[PDB]
Scaffold this active site. Structure first.
Site, PDB file in Angstrom:
ATOM      1  N   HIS A  29       8.860  -4.942  -5.158  1.00 50.93           N
ATOM      2  CA  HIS A  29       8.715  -4.142  -6.366  1.00 50.93           C
ATOM      3  C   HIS A  29       9.109  -2.697  -6.074  1.00 50.93           C
ATOM      4  O   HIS A  29       9.269  -2.311  -4.922  1.00 50.93           O
ATOM      5  CB  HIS A  29       7.279  -4.195  -6.907  1.00 50.93           C
ATOM      6  CG  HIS A  29       6.293  -3.339  -6.153  1.00 50.93           C
ATOM      7  ND1 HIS A  29       6.669  -2.361  -5.249  1.00 50.93           N
ATOM      8  CD2 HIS A  29       4.938  -3.291  -6.207  1.00 50.93           C
ATOM      9  CE1 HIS A  29       5.593  -1.762  -4.771  1.00 50.93           C
ATOM     10  NE2 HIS A  29       4.528  -2.308  -5.333  1.00 50.93           N
ATOM     11  N   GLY A  52       0.798  -1.222   0.000  1.00 47.75           N
ATOM     12  CA  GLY A  52       0.000   0.000   0.000  1.00 47.75           C
ATOM     13  C   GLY A  52       0.827   1.266   0.000  1.00 47.75           C
ATOM     14  O   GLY A  52       1.772   1.401  -0.776  1.00 47.75           O
ATOM     15  N   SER A  97       5.266  -5.788  -1.663  1.00 49.04           N
ATOM     16  CA  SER A  97       5.771  -4.413  -1.642  1.00 49.04           C
ATOM     17  C   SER A  97       6.054  -3.956  -0.207  1.00 49.04           C
ATOM     18  O   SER A  97       7.005  -4.430   0.411  1.00 49.04           O
ATOM     19  CB  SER A  97       4.814  -3.465  -2.389  1.00 49.04           C
ATOM     20  OG  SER A  97       3.814  -2.918  -1.544  1.00 49.04           O
ATOM     21  N   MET A  98       5.194  -3.093   0.333  1.00 45.91           N
ATOM     22  CA  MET A  98       5.433  -2.460   1.625  1.00 45.91           C
ATOM     23  C   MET A  98       5.183  -3.400   2.802  1.00 45.91           C
ATOM     24  O   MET A  98       5.619  -3.147   3.927  1.00 45.91           O
ATOM     25  CB  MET A  98       4.606  -1.183   1.763  1.00 45.91           C
ATOM     26  CG  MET A  98       5.279  -0.077   2.588  1.00 45.91           C
ATOM     27  SD  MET A  98       6.807   0.634   1.882  1.00 45.91           S
ATOM     28  CE  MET A  98       6.438   0.635   0.121  1.00 45.91           C
ATOM     29  N   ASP A 126       8.013  -6.993 -10.986  1.00 49.59           N
ATOM     30  CA  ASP A 126       7.544  -7.801  -9.857  1.00 49.59           C
ATOM     31  C   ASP A 126       8.392  -9.060  -9.665  1.00 49.59           C
ATOM     32  O   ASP A 126       8.637  -9.830 -10.605  1.00 49.59           O
ATOM     33  CB  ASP A 126       6.073  -8.172 -10.017  1.00 49.59           C
ATOM     34  CG  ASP A 126       5.131  -7.024  -9.681  1.00 49.59           C
ATOM     35  OD1 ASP A 126       3.893  -7.246  -9.778  1.00 49.59           O
ATOM     36  OD2 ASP A 126       5.612  -5.913  -9.322  1.00 49.59           O
TER      37      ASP A 126
END
Lengths: 189, 189, 186, 189, 186, 180, 184, 182, 185, 185, 185
Positions: free
Chosen positions: D120, D66, D95-96, D169
């Site tokens: 990513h 996010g 990701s995060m 990715d």
């Protein structure tokens, strides 16, 4: 969603039914499998291990499936906690919901006589560039292999049978899920 | 929108502007290249050949791109007919528009000084089962190869180099496109 | 959609000028309107001259099986040879029509693609409405493969395997397959 | 979302399941990371520190990532508080989420054997004036660097490897996540 | 769009009748489709007579940069002089086309306004895709500044200052600035 | 929302902690002011901790909070975590001197207020003058609270300007970068 | 929609119209029906002895619009040959059967479908009965004519149309809907 | 609705007396609640009857079976009382009650019909969907045949289109055992 | 909309039928369709005021007010207007049918005829609702009276028979006075 | 919806009123509302099968099925159920009004009562429509029958008086036999 | 809506005023609002039928059928019901205002009162529209008559004054006799 009122020597306990069943170590997986749902299931499993780490847990399953990622969340938490988890399929266990079905403790995976079970290959999606799409295609085939591998151990079927049987939607009768190795017993009334 | 009216000994000739240009063997491509645009351009080439198989054709290109499938139809039709198709880029030749720009008769591929040319990978998409995505992945990869191959033959660039330069959106000044072999001359003054 | 005038004053739009040279363009999805037009052009061209060949350039992603057969049956019905030329892509019914060109005269351009796949349908309602619908589409699958067999030289059971999912074919592959007779060079 | 009711001297305390788990110093993160989820995690962290600044905190992670900004709030607060924070990935840390998985106290970052991790580069947008686009671009490149810089500190891979590895990715298994230094151990049943 | 007639029977619309006098009306948003119409008219006109002056009336709010250059570059390309006349409004790309007319022959009516500003764009997706877009739209700001410098007589630096925000000019201020050669008095 | 039947912000509120974790609209400002007045009321000498992770919002709603901070008796510490943008950054700056903080990776952004106007030339002149007037009000208070001139602030807020935690301290938006 | 020029300029359907050919390639609504009838009235006016060819590829549509065409076909003097290409379903199928005896054709891969009419009723009990009685009354009008035109009993048609029934061109011939399958 | 916060609503009051109310479409959530209430009641007391009132348009076949098999699984008798309407899956749940303890009120209505499906995609996928829903029709019929005494042939014919039975025709059919007279 | 080319007249299909004095009504009746029919009728009179005009009808009906436009023009002009119903003549479609020249109103054997009350609506104040109510009951009398004159049927019968939708067969419409002859075969 | 608190415990006004054996039906009748009404009825029986029940009725009506759930339950339980119309009792709401215990059906002076035909819908094939039509006609016969029996009117009369919207004054409903007294003041 | 606490009674603000016999009508009047008010009135009468009740009114109005339910219950119950208009009492809201116990209908100095005709609607057949038109006129009469009794104004005058919207200042509502006193300070 009804409330049950319980009386203790300190005061009144107000339980919605799912929370009263959870007091008897019963977890109901009654919807589609997504992140909020996984988070709920995993939390219930962690809570019950804490309460008592030696008593069985009953995971009731009626799910059309959903996120593979969320299912593994559940799966892994089952394989990690100390008490046995019995799985009962009621009604329908399709795709990831049938995966968790097969993920219950050996000897303790049940289905009711009219429960239906479905195995299929996972669904994904990709937009954009030729390399983007290839990354997404490789990831989904990779998780196909993972799923087939784990199912093989769990059912005793060869990866290659699983690969052919999951090629298109495959509907199994409760009795056929026993022959397949997905469940151990059909609970006859 | 406008109309041109011409006088013939036996009546009057009302031409929309693109029709009056067609009579002088000029084809205008100024839109996205879908099947309709393709169908019209192929028709136009086929007609212009049927009039005079010798005289040159002029294909002006202001197009941000579109269906890969519709590019090749134009491309192969250009290769099939006997007349030399001169390609002149005005404004922006992007995606399948620059591919078509490179398709012009060798020596007769032009750009106006401030014209933009963009080269990139093809775009695509797949939804559904793992093996369906694999089919869509394999396919889009096969057309990247096919495009790289044709682009290579026409620019004088290597396949590896085109592979790198198209990985992301790549913007080219008209002189940069000249130096890359996409065009022959930057048309002054 | 450009205009071409010749000498009153014969004023044609571009496709209608091509029709004069016996060229039909199928460059869109095959629905009922498109079928009706093609069929109509084919009848017109027969009425003009039952001897001279007809050229059906094809760039189609496919469409209604029913609308595709109307064209197919009309090609078979009229006297003149109908040459099919695939430009760009001939998918689903497009490829089937491509295969329907007069024998010896089914062509592809070098970078033409070809695709063969199962027909696509849908059913909603009662269990027995679904049954009727399943049975119908399976019956049209058999019909498609059998005609496809006759015209390609392939077995009924091979086309069944090869069209089970999306099968993308090269022009050279489509010649190997029996769907076209020649790849057009240059 | 189920409830647990405990009997205390004062009376009958009913917790939601996540609040029962909070009493055991467990924090659950099951959703996207947005300003509300940030605030909630942060608050649970500030709360646990107040209760006991010594005992370990357990933060379970299953998240599709996010907001870079909300993620950083969580991150900074883990570093800021005194008690060690163990991160355990279940299902998906993307990701995060994966950045946060890596933020765990050294020696104490885990994954369950089927958990997936994805790294990513950040995503963003910008509209309007050329110089407004520049300001948005410069800022996203600055945060890409800030993200890489910290991941490097947390993992021991270089700034240049992470840049190559996060261009598209990138899907890691838990075992590859241990090799990359995103986690310390893979928990086996 | 009303009809004029010339005595067969020559049926025209007004723009088509003004086109006979070598007048091109650019009176809308500038997109590729409209750049198309304008490029064609210019090419047709050069074909009819490469000496006679061409009249380009401009009432545009702006539009695509690339569609603007298409037009801009074709004016430079063709032999005949293009006289640009600003009626109503000419903003951004339309004001770049205004300044693009033959030297001494860029006009505006007394109450026309002209607006110069930054090119607008938009980037979405990954950090690296934002970079490529950012760099592309800085490269085209420069081209527009560069060309506009040659056309006005103003330096690159003043034009950078002057296009920062929207900046509306009076016909008389566009003369001062070097965008038009004269304000057309009755 | 981890919940006892006390939700989690209500437990932190007990320790004099206020979280601002969203856009600043009327309701948020109402909530935050209400908390401020209430904490003042439980004890008027003890500090208050105001955490900020706010994309910003209504100038007006921000001001309700600003003046409430200056009005009550106790010091309000501002601690930026994540991002404090536009009105968030203003609120960050609005905390008591010596007590404005940022965590090492927090980001600050300052800019002009945004707005709108439709209709008649003069209705647009009223709305124009109003927005220009509130910009000077913001720029004025930011001068008094950063140590920078009103001339350097107009310069700096003309477009979106992103400062690091250390650049926020250089600039006077915060007093310290909180470590470790 | 291509143009043909003789100097006379037609679109293809109007060119075909000169050779007494009418094409019905769409749903049957009031507009399509309006246009066929007119075409048939026009063709009669041109010449009353010469045959008319109605090519059919339609999924059907309004029953009441099918009857306009049906009745117009019966009323005019020239014989109307009907040819099914692709699909002739529901009301299309009925119109196919409406051709002149000995002159109803289908192409080998054309499909025919026969089924009940379709309708709707909303409102009060008695408004629903009126719509019901009405649609049942039309079902019997259809059956009765199909029966006169195919030779099959009303009992048989009643059953064979209870659900969707798909016929090959060969089955349509055996059934009486058509007279000949057009080979080759 | 309507509420004592003590929330202790009307259906909670009825549960206390072992009454489960089914007054809505049958989907997963409704089934879950029902099954859960059925398990809860068994745990309380294993020998006392349970009353399931059914006023339902029906719904998901799968959700219906969940309840059905839970009813067969647990130890106490589940009386089923139809009020108003019990249609498709609802009528199936009506028939499902303990033998001798299936009721309808005099004006209540019962409708039986085929299962309802859908299918989009390739020919083969449509074939797969058809086969499954035919397999679920056989399965419903066969159970209803045990439950009613009527044979597979009769049930097949009688569920071809919507079939509306009055309470008295439902007793004649063997769907209920008695019409509850006032 | 197919084209017919004579020698250089280029009438589209309905225009070529207009040449033979044929008027095609094959849609809902509203203000556009009405305005078109009227214009055609007026045109046709101008050309020749003795020769019959043929109006084919297949209308679900439409606006009452547009119906009278047509009805009144039919009466007004001097040529006979023969009405042929093909397919459906419902509501204002069957009113027009009954309005053709006496002795010259036909229907093809499978045509259907529906007669029903006019539909309307009203929103607003009690007084505004009454105004709309009394209007619609007045136009109901207007239609019923004209219907009576054109059919021979009593106004009382027409009031009962149109309470709800009434679906007549061509043969029933003949019996009823709506058409003169059923065009066999 | 306002709270009332008792000591010995918070109540809805509705479940406060239920402590006085009062059930409020103040909305459209679908399954949800019926369910809630039935449940309220069965609860009150459990609390005492002797004392009467007060069912206030302000409803525009709704589902026939859902109405009959309430009607049958009222019939079934042991206690008398008084029905009181305040405001509006329309369609199925007035059927339930005439369903109260003998001599115990009331209306307030200004309550309106409306009776009409049931409403339905059918789409698909002729046979599916016939099935639908026949079922709804069977439900008309059922409603009319039970109304006939309770109001004292004949079936033939109830059929005619409910053919379309029939608004009845409170006095007029006493005449008609839907209620027994008009409550006064 | 804020909470009040008693030592533990957790009242919401409206439920604390219901304790002091104050009922707040702030919204549009529909079947739900009316069901709540009727419920509140019944409840207050069971608790003490001698003590006054206070209905504060601030409403644009709404359903006539809803309002009359409230109207009929007020007259029906033993306690006197004082009605106070705060801000606005429009149409049905001003009707309820007029319906308070004699000598006890109040308004605040700046309270605005509007009176007009009831609104309705009808779509469908001519006879369908007539039945609707009839019902609404009968409704208008009824309203007029009850307003006549309560203000001491003739039917003809109320008839005229409500033809279009009529806004009345607080003092004018007193002369007109809708309220009894205007409440100072």
């Amino acid at each position: 969603i009804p409330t049950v009122i319980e009386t203790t020597n300190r005061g009144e306990r107000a339980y919605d039914i799912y929370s009263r069943l959870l007091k008897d170590r019963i977890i109901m997986l009654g919807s589609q499998i997504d992140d909020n749902v996984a988070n709920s299931i995993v939390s219930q499993l962690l809570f019950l291990q804490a309460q008592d780490s030696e008593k069985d847990i009953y995971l009731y399953i009626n799910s059309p499936g959903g996120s593979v990622t969320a299912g593994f969340a559940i799966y892994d938490t089952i394989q990690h906690i100390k008490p046995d988890v019995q799985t009962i399929c009621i009604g329908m266990a399709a795709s990831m919901g049938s995966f968790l079905l097969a993920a219950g403790a050996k000897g303790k995976r049940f289905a009711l006589p009219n429960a239906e079970v479905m195995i299929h290959q996972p669904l994904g999606g990709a937009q954009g560039q030729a390399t983007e799409i290839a990354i997404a295609a490789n990831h989904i085939l990779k998780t196909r292999e993972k799923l087939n591998r784990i199912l093989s151990e769990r059912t005793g079927q060869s990866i290659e049978k699983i690969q052919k049987d999951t090629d298109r939607d495959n509907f199994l009768t409760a009795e056929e899920a026993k022959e397949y190795g997905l469940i151990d017993e059909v609970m006859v009334p």
